[PDB]
Amino acid sequence: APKNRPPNTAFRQQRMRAWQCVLTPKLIVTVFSILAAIYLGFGAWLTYLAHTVRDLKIDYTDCLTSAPKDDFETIPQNHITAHFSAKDSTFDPYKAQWKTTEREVQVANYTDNRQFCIVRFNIPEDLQPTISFFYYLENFYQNHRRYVNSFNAKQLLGDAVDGKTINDSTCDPITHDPKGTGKIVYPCGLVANSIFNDTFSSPLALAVRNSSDSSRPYNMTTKGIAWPGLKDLYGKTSYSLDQIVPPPNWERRYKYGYQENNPPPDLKTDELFQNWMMLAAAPNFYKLYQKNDTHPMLAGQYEIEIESNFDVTVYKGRKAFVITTLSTMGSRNIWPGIIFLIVGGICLVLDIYFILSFFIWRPRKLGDPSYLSWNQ
Amino acid sequence: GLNSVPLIVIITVTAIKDAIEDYRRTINAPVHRLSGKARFHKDAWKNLVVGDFVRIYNDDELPADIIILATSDPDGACYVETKNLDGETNLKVRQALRCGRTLKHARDCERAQFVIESEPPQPNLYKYNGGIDNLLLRGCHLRNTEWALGVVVFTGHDTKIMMNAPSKRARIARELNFNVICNFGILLIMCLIAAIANGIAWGKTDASLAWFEYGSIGGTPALTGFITFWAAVIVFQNLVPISLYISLEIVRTLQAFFIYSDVGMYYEKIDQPCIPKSWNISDDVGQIEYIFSDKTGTLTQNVMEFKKATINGQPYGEAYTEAQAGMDRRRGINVEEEAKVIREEIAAAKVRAIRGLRELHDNPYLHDEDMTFIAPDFVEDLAGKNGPEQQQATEHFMLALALCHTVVAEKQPGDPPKMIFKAQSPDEAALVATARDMGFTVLGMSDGGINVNVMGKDMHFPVLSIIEFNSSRKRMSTIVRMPDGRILLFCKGADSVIYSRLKKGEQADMRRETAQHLEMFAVEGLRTLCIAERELSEEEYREWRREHDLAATALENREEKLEEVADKIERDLTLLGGTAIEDRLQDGVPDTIALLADAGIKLWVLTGDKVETAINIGFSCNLLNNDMDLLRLQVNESDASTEDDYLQLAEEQLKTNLERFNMTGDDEELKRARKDHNAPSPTYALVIDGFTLRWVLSDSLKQKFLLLCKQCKSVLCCRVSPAQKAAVVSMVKNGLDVMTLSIGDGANDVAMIQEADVGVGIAGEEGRQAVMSSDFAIGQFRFLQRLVLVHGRWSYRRLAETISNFFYKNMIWTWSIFWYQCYCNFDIAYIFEYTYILMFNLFFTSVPVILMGVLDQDVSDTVSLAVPQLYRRGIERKEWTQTKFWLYMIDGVYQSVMSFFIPFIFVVLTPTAAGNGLDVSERTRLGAYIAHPAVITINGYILINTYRWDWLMLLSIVLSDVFIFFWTGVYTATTYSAGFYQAAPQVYQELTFWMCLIVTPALCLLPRLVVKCIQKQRFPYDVDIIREQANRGDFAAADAAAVA
Ligand SMILES: *[C@@H]1O[C@H](CO)[C@@H](O[C@@H]2O[C@H](CO)[C@@H](O[C@@H]3O[C@H](CO)[C@@H](O)[C@H](O)[C@@H]3O)[C@H](O)[C@H]2NC(C)=O)[C@H](O)[C@H]1NC(C)=O
Ligand SMILES: Nc1ncnc2c1ncn2[C@@H]1O[C@H](COP(=O)(O)OP(=O)(O)CP(=O)(O)O)[C@@H](O)[C@H]1O
Ligand SMILES: *[C@@H]1O[C@H](CO)[C@@H](O[C@@H]2O[C@H](CO)[C@@H](O)[C@H](O)[C@H]2NC(C)=O)[C@H](O)[C@H]1NC(C)=O
Ligand SMILES: *[C@@H]1O[C@H](CO)[C@@H](O)[C@H](O)[C@H]1NC(C)=O
Ligand SMILES: [Mg+2]
């Protein structure tokens, strides 16, 4: 059989099992009646969630100037923002007394003097056992072509990669001691250099004289604020402490180099560094500082000591700190709910228009032979 | 690697597609070879390089264009058979090059290096240098040579044997440059915005850039801008259509495979499906407006039956043709009842003539339903009745029909032996085929001449010589010894050729009636012939033959010497009678033509036949109607030799026909006609001769002519030469901007096939010269209704939608990168984890588009033939416009806005956004957040557009949408990523990820779904109405007839 016919199958002859997707004003309505339902549902859920959580963000970028050194006074409410629902309790999270000061600090056997800001805010509801504490930085770009690739992750992992292999890496500016001595930089880079380094205290419940305990500290730990998978990237160093040096604007923390009594950081356990090294995506971003998992934050006035090291007003930026409680969606974003509700609402309006018109106004008899452009 | 790895996989997949296309088209010949193998080992054609040693044995096929340097036989000679390549049969002799005739061994080939400074492609079949003494062809067979020290000079496609086979390109594959150039325009506008904005935002010297970032890439504001510009050109790479052409190549080769493998276009006899020799023109078939057909092999079967004959003034017609059928029945007389009872009487006469034939002596080669000269008058006269000498006239005539030829005989055993009679022409073959139809069966050239069993009892005819027909003869002669010992000359041919070579003034009583019988024949719709005989003598034939040979033995100017010396015997001839030849209209043409002319396209029949047969057989093939008030263009003769007569006559004719409506020759009515394609009025038609054509195709009238030939629904061109056939194609394809198809068979129409946009070759009875020069090698004419009306309009709509979506998706990706750049000071920072940027246009979003382009169909296989008028939308070129391109790009831009700013509003405006506290909205977690909804919305948007959601398309949508999830889950879980290290568990587990994944595609698809539905309900096309009709089940009875 020397035949030459093409095999008759369901593919070569173009007969594959199909579903002719022909729109009909009974397929249009049963689609704009499913989308509207699903989106109004999910939107109601998400807006209930976003209205659940309660938080407070205090801005203090100008604490070194507009805060008297002696005693306390009121923060102008153009700094405080608060989303609670206690509805005018005796705490009113819009009256946040605040003061500034200058205090010596025992860093490591050399006792440098820093400048502190004390903030006394009010929290009118018993926040729930998971309470995070973020810092917020406006106008600070961590997303630049040079800034994001500038680190040697093979060194953050813990290695003795020395000299040329680091001199000519992507960390081009900051790779040696800005002095005579030929020295590697250990956390070398441009992103490990600029690490935000204000330090916050754990909030201290002030004594209203009604609760006998004067000031019970609300211990919030900085352990477990990074993903537990990041510790697979970092590790304890391996340089011999004689060939490393802190990055340029780390010096006020390590003024005498990396000594045996002021040793380099252990990046693996350091979970305020692994929050910086995973870069933000916008100019205005938040990062996690302190977390609490096992207790509720009772109502009352709290006090925080924020040493103000990161001078932010020098590039027209701002910085703040925010105490959030969580939901399953995240923190307070009123916008997913409203977006879902807008999409659901316009699907409902279009569903009304279609069911109404295509059922009540000119059904336009299906497939009729009068619009065929050759019957005219 | 971000650009180098795509730019190598592109050439890899292009090579692979070429390979698989060659696979599914052809579905490794041996050549002995050696520069370092130390031996002429055998190798295969896929091992071919330039300048490498070769050995070639007896009768080998050759691999490519070769040079030789030596061989075993002296003089270095080599023989070639070339019947497959060149029409001349002689074994052509090359010589192996002189200097280098000593290399004879298995390793002795290496040291004698010789330089080969050859020349580029010298396509001219008899040209090569660096003559033909060294040109070894490819398909030729190398003979009479022990071996051949092959040192070729070329290989691959650089041989003429493949080169002489005019690469055309579709109409939109040539208007795509505007779209690609506008893409680059928008890309450079984005890159210039990036440069002039980064250079500014970098010169602020107070913002957080100055303190924490130590300078720039190159310290300068206006040089930072320049580096940003070029890095942006690198980052908006996805807007490089580098992947558009490798996607269109795939969709086109796969559509062409879909029409090659169609079984509805498999003609079982010739055993050849519709092999598309030009795969890159499959969408051109969807825009055709003009079809230039033929009138033999194409419209008709080209198998000619012997219908009528008249001898001694007695005619035996007893037959009917379809031309006269239409002509008479279209009025009130002989309309329907006679239309059937006439063939009833014909069949009765068939039975009576079968009886009369079987009253004769046994001729086993006579079979029922294989006789087409049905005439009970013929057999009743040959049997003995109604004539003593008219019986002798019929016997002599019937023997002459069995002598005058050169036809060769082929017998079939088994069943009653019926003999086929093969010769060069289906014209004369019918004469001897009917000769064997009433007895007188003929056998081979039996070593003295052919053997005829006269009334079944055998006898031999010593054939002395044959003067064979040529197009410059229009007749052919055979000089044969009559069985009674004497010799006799026969000469059969047309009317104008024999009638001059007659004995002037004899048998006028018979001639003046056979000539009018010929008039009736030719006007009835046939192509008649006539036969003459002459009683020769031995000395007269000898004194002719001596000069015939002495002028034939002359090598030079032989063509005009035998016309002289052969004419010395042809002056004297006397008629034996006149005949008639019909060629049946093909089975399925009267419907294909009505269907095509119904789709809106215009039909031109460049017939090489007479004019009245052309008009009548154009009425019979549904091409003409009764409302088609055909208007004729004819300039006559007697106009001496002066063109002013001819030119002025043609001019006034054209001017009157153009005053039959608005105006003539107006290049404002031409500048306007050059831009409209509106379905010609069904009321007009033209009939133009082959003489008037030559004068109206004068350069001062063409414009005028063109306008007329745009207003009519059909045009007949009666008796055109091979020249005007291609001249009119060129005039109407270049005068107007129109598309064009040309159908034909035989080398006569190669120029018609080649000068047009699409050239279709019927594998006709004549030859394989219009197949090797065509695009699609069609079995027979009625497959046009399948090809043009199904695969044509599909393949056009499909590529329209494919390129629309391929522009849309590149826009929606790169513009959503750009939108991010507004938040990184336009300093180009990847948001997308670069491997996404290199996988997008390859895996995540390519297969669904290719599939919606290759296996999507709007109506059906059979609802597209039931309603042909849909094709009109591809005549007006309304599927791929400029408004569609801009609407799709605006759609891409809007969906980019929403598909970047929703997954940004979700995560970058909350503290944590992760519901368990930790940090998403890293720069690459946001990348995953906006890359999963984008790959969902692109594919879900090329489902909104596809018409038939079949199995493969939905399966590929699901595979493409789950592959991104799979490969993020697999690429993250490895420290090689190191910033995108565990984004799979850290993003998929979230709730905001899935909320954005379900609300971004809808917010980006709604403004198109609403338009689509409101339009398909309030401003419907024709396709959607035919679809809503094939949903009720209207054309389900058509599909029902099709499956039955
Ligand atoms: C989340 O915050 C709560 C704050 O109450 C933390 O619990 C407080 O944690 C301290 C740990 O020292 C508790 O211990 C105290 O120890 C001293 C002596 O070392 C003892 O004298 C005290 O009486 C007390 O035992 C304190 O109990 C506990 N607060 C209360 C009222 O019990 C909690 O640890 C924080 N989350 C995490 C992760 O730590
Ligand atoms: N052996 C023969 N004896 C007498 N006449 C012959 C002949 N062979 C061919 N002819 C005549 O010579 C002519 C050859 O041209 P031909 O008929 O092939 O053109 P054509 O009709 O194929 C052009 P088209 O394809 O447009 O129909 C025919 O019209 C035929 O009458
Ligand atoms: C990495 O680059 C630095 C910068 O030059 C190297 O060189 C040190 O440069 C300072 C001047 O800034 C000199 O005083 C030091 O003496 C240089 N090093 C040495 C060897 O003394 C450093 O050496 C580089 N790494 C390598 C491979 O040399
Ligand atoms: C709890 O906080 C107090 C002050 O706020 C601090 O002195 C103490 O060390 C903290 N406890 C732990 C276990 O860190
Ligand atoms: Mg022909």
Coordinates of C-alpha atoms and ligand atoms in Angstrom, one line a residue, chain A residues 162-167 175-177 179-184, ligand 3:
Chain A
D162 CA 40.6 39.0 50.7
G163 CA 41.9 42.0 48.8
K164 CA 41.6 41.9 45.1
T165 CA 38.6 39.6 44.9
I166 CA 36.9 42.2 47.1
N167 CA 38.6 45.3 45.7
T175 CA 36.4 48.2 50.1
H176 CA 39.5 49.3 52.0
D177 CA 40.4 51.3 55.1
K179 CA 43.5 55.4 55.9
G180 CA 47.1 54.1 55.4
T181 CA 46.8 50.6 56.8
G182 CA 45.9 48.1 54.1
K183 CA 42.8 46.5 55.5
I184 CA 39.7 44.7 54.3
Ligands
LIG3 C1 42.3 46.7 47.8 O1 42.4 48.0 47.3 C2 43.2 48.8 48.2 C3 43.3 50.2 47.7 O2 44.6 50.5 47.0 C4 44.6 48.2 48.3 O3 45.7 49.0 48.6 C5 46.0 49.6 49.8 O4 45.9 51.0 49.5 C6 46.4 51.9 50.4 C7 46.2 53.3 50.0 O5 44.8 53.6 50.2 C8 47.9 51.6 50.7 O6 48.5 52.4 51.7 C9 48.0 50.2 51.2 O7 49.4 50.0 51.4 C10 47.5 49.3 50.1 N1 47.6 47.9 50.4 C11 48.8 47.4 50.8 C12 49.2 46.1 50.2 O8 49.6 48.0 51.6 C13 44.6 46.8 48.9 O9 45.9 46.3 48.9 C14 43.7 46.1 47.8 N2 43.8 44.7 48.0 C15 44.9 44.2 47.5 C16 44.8 42.9 46.8 O10 45.9 44.8 47.5

